[PDB]
Design a protein around this nucleic acid. Structure first.
Lengths: 73, 59
DNA sequence: TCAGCCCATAAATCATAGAG
DNA sequence: ACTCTATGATTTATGGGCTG
């Protein structure tokens, strides 16, 4: 099951993944349906309300749009 | 949700291993692979994503 | 300017189609 | 007949290029 590449290429080098709770996810999903975009303020109040950071909320929304972009809906 | 056909995997694996030094097909290349395999470019992307990672993982 | 967006990708993890 | 592994998709998270 082990791979033996004839040579080790750059892309081959490196570069636990916390899961969100039903509540966090449900709420985020809930917020996103109110407005696919967030204001610096709303971003902060939601981050505190869900024990998540600002970054994590920003990123969660970024990813959420990519998914919204995809699935054309 | 079934798996890709036998021919589609051979095609993707062939492209993949033929480009081991840089397994990052362009948008056009992804579209041509998708056409021949009969899937979406998105499925091609997932396919390369999983392949790239699962491969370096077993080195 | 520059915080925030898009896009492509990483890496771990979910779900289950089938090869053993 | 039945068990796990490999496989396709989805979920967190990084970074770069670009524009309001």
């Amino acid at each position: 099951g082990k791979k033996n590449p004839p040579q080790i290429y750059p892309w081959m080098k490196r570069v636990q993944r916390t899961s969100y709770t039903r509540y966090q996810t449900l709420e985020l999903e809930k917020e996103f349906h109110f407005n696919r975009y967030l204001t610096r303020r709303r971003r902060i109040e939601i981050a505190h309300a869900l024990s998540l950071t600002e970054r994590q909320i920003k990123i969660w929304f970024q990813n959420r749009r990519m998914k919204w972009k995809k699935e054309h809906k | 949700r079934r798996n890709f056909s036998k021919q589609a995997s051979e095609i993707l694996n062939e492209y993949f291993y033929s480009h081991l030094s840089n397994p990052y097909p362009s948008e056009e290349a992804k579209e041509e692979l998708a056409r021949k395999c009969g899937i979406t470019v998105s499925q091609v992307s997932n396919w390369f994503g999983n392949k790239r990672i699962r491969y370096k993982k077993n080195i």
